[PDB]
């Protein structure tokens, strides 16, 4: 938690959070929006499949 809070305060994307490949130098504030859009698309895909 200390490491994660440090990363969030400095605005760096946490290493644990970064699981899909991203362009270099990508901050966490835009990473959150990108991940939100990806999750929305994943929910649409899963709802269509189910």
């Amino acid at each position: 938690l200390r490491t994660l809070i440090n990363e969030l305060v400095k605005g760096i994307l946490p290493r644990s959070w970064s699981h899909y490949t991203v362009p270099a130098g990508m901050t966490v504030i835009q990473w959150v929006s990108d991940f939100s859009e990806r999750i929305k698309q994943l929910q649409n895909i899963s709802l269509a499949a189910a």
Partner: peptide
């Protein structure tokens, strides 16, 4: 601390923005 409160607000906003469901 100001950093503590601003991080609380930022994380709460992120929780609001981030979707909360994804079924396998």
């Amino acid at each position: 601390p100001a950093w503590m409160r601003t991080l609380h607000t930022t994380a709460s906003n992120w929780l609001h923005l981030i979707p909360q469901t994804l079924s396998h």
